[PDB]
Each structure stands twice: as C-alpha cells, then as structure tokens.
C-alpha cells in the first residue's frame, strides 16, 4: 500500500492464488507453492529454474486444484496444447 508521499507502508504483501486471484491468507495452511520444472527441449534434462504456481486452499478443498494446475501448464506451454 502507498501513501501520498509515495511510500510502501504495509509490512508485507500477501500471495494471490494463481487460479482464483484470491489473496491466500496468512493462516491458509491448505495452500500450496508447487514448482513445475521446465526442461530444455534438445537434451531433455533439468535446467534449474522453475515455473512456480500457488493454489488457494479453497479450490483444493473443492476439487479444481488439478484442473487449475493443468490450465496453468497450458498457458505457459508446459503441457502440450494438443493434450
């Protein structure tokens, strides 16, 4: 958050679910910080950085955590768009 002087004043900025864009609360112990590894195409080994996501506990408890992860993989090209 800002003030008129133009200063970040909150102590920390919370995460936001990569699927529902809802702020993941500080006590949402059912949230996840999954890290999907990308792979260099020619040799097919592990490159070293990630394609991290974040799912709120609510949709996990609802049942769309795997469908959301699948749609996020398609948006980043990890899962073949043919699928």
């Amino acid at each position: 958050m800002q003030n008129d002087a133009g200063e970040f004043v909150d102590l920390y900025v919370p995460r936001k679910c990569s699927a529902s864009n809802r702020i993941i609360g500080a006590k949402d112990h059912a949230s996840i910080q999954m890290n999907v590894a990308e792979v260099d195409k020619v040799t097919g080994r592990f490159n070293g950085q990630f394609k991290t996501y974040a799912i709120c506990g609510a949709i996990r408890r609802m049942g769309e955590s795997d469908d959301s992860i699948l749609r996020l993989a398609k948006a980043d090209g990890i899962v073949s768009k043919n699928f």
């Binding site: 112990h29 059912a30 949230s31 996840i32 910080q33 999954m34 890290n35 999907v36 590894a37 990308e38 792979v39 195409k41 020619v42 040799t43 097919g44 080994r45 592990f46 990630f50 799912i55 506990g57 996990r60 408890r61 049942g63 769309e64 955590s65 795997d66 469908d67 992860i69 699948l70 993989a73 090209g77 990890i78 899962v79 073949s80 768009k81 043919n82 699928f83």
Partner: protein, 217 residues
C-alpha cells in the same frame, strides 16, 4: 512435455499401457475425471485417454525433480497392490516410502517419532489413502495421486488418470514415473531403455508367490 518430441510417449510405452490395461477405467465416472476419458464403451467401461495420461505423467514428474532434496518427498500406499511398487520407487529415486497403516498424525504431531515433514506427497489411490490427503491440508503439501475414473479429487493437486485396480497396472506407472524422474535429472540415457524391468514393481499374490517356487525348484 509440450510439443517437445523428446518427451512424447514412444511406441514401446503404449504397448506397455495396453498390455497392463491402464487405459481401461472404472464402471462409473467422477465428474472431475471427465477431462481425461475418451469414451464409455459398451459393457459399461470407460477408456482413459492415454495421450492425456502421458501428459499428466510427465507433468507430475516435473514437480518431483523440481524438489532439490530427493528425500523429502513421501511416497505412500495402504492398499496391498501398491506397497511393493512404492518401496522400489523410493529406492530408485531416493524418497522415503510409507507402506500401509498410515498412522494419523505423522504430519501434524511433533512428539511423534514418525513425524515427517515432506515437500510433496504422491499417492496410489485417493480413496484408499484418504487419510494422508487430509493431513496434506493442515500443512502446505502439494499432492499427486494415481487417480481412476471414480477417484475423488479432494485435496489432489495433480492427478494421473490411470487404472489403480490391477496389480499389473499400478506397478507400471510406478515404473513409468521412475524412468522420467530419473530421466530429467541425469541418471539414465533416453536412447537405450531402462535396465529395470516393469515386472519388478508388480504386486505378487501370496498364491503366485509359492506357485512359481516349484516352477523354480
């Protein structure tokens, strides 16, 4: 996994999927699992689309190799079909296996000597192992599960549409992931196949345990 011709399912794998019967799903259907099924044939048995099973199989493998320390990824199974597959998965990769009788509280109770704090939990069956999935909600724990057309998707963070009924099938994807998880990090060459045989992961009936002995005696 995405249009990278190195990671497309090759012809030897599909012959393993057809022989083991992983494409053949359950009789009924979960509304969450309609994303991975081809069509319900007559005799009332769904067909799991293997091409969409292969894509999830690699996607699950991306998460594991992303985890630095290969120990803090728990591999569990309570049904008799999966124990033999998960101890040799965790021995091939370096994970910590849990074979049967998941005592409730191994993720939330400190005083426990069986207190584990993994980073990722892969499961053989969401129904049979319904307990550890719940504990995966009290601690921030991504989850993988060898789901079937009937398995619910509560707290399952990525699913692998499979047939988790037959012994020949369950051991196969525990042998399938074993290859890819060791193919991402340099352990195996993708050109020549893996020396480990997929029959090694299969669950042996106590009947066939002592029926092949005299075939060897």
């Amino acid at each position: 996994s995405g249009a990278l011709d190195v990671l497309q399912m090759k012809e030897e794998d599909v012959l393993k999927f057809l022989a083991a019967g992983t494409h053949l799903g359950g009789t009924n259907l979960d509304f969450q699992m309609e994303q991975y099924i081809y069509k319900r044939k007559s005799d009332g048995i769904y067909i799991i689309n293997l091409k969409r099973t292969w894509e999830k199989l690699l996607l699950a493998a991306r998460a594991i190799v992303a985890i630095e320390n290969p120990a803090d990824v728990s591999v569990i199974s309570s049904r008799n079909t999966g124990q033999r597959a998960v101890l040799k998965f965790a021995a091939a990769t370096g994970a910590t296996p849990i074979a049967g009788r998941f005592t409730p509280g191994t993720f939330t109770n400190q005083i426990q000597t069986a207190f584990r704090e993994p980073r990722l939990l892969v499961v053989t069956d969401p129904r049979a192992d319904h307990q550890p999935l719940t504990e995966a909600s009290y601690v921030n724990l991504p989850t993988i599960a060898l789901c079937n057309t009937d398995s619910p998707l509560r707290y399952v963070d990525i699913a692998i549409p499979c047939n988790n009924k037959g012994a020949h099938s369950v051991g196969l994807m525990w042998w399938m992931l074993a290859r890819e998880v060791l193919r991402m990090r340099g352990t195996i060459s993708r050109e020549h196949p893996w020396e480990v045989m997929p029959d090694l992961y299969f669950y042996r009936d106590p009947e066939e345990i002592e029926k092949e002995e005299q075939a060897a005696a």
